[PDB]
Write a protein that binds this ligand. Structure first.
Ligand SMILES: [Cl-]
Lengths: 32, 32
């Protein structure tokens, strides 16, 4: 990977984790 | 959220986790 691609993938990793956390918060709020 | 939205977002969570793992594998393969 180029340095640019490496940087992009590290940023994508953090963003995927943030999206997971947001989804988890929404799902956990759905009281039955 | 509707039950359908709960199901959909749970599936999106699974996909995000898989994509994150694939990106991590690519990052861990890098070399100086
Ligand atoms: Cl949370």
């Amino acid at each position: 990977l180029s340095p640019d691609a490496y940087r992009f993938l590290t940023e994508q990793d953090r963003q995927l984790r943030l999206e997971q956390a947001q989804i988890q918060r929404l799902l956990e709020a759905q009281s039955l």
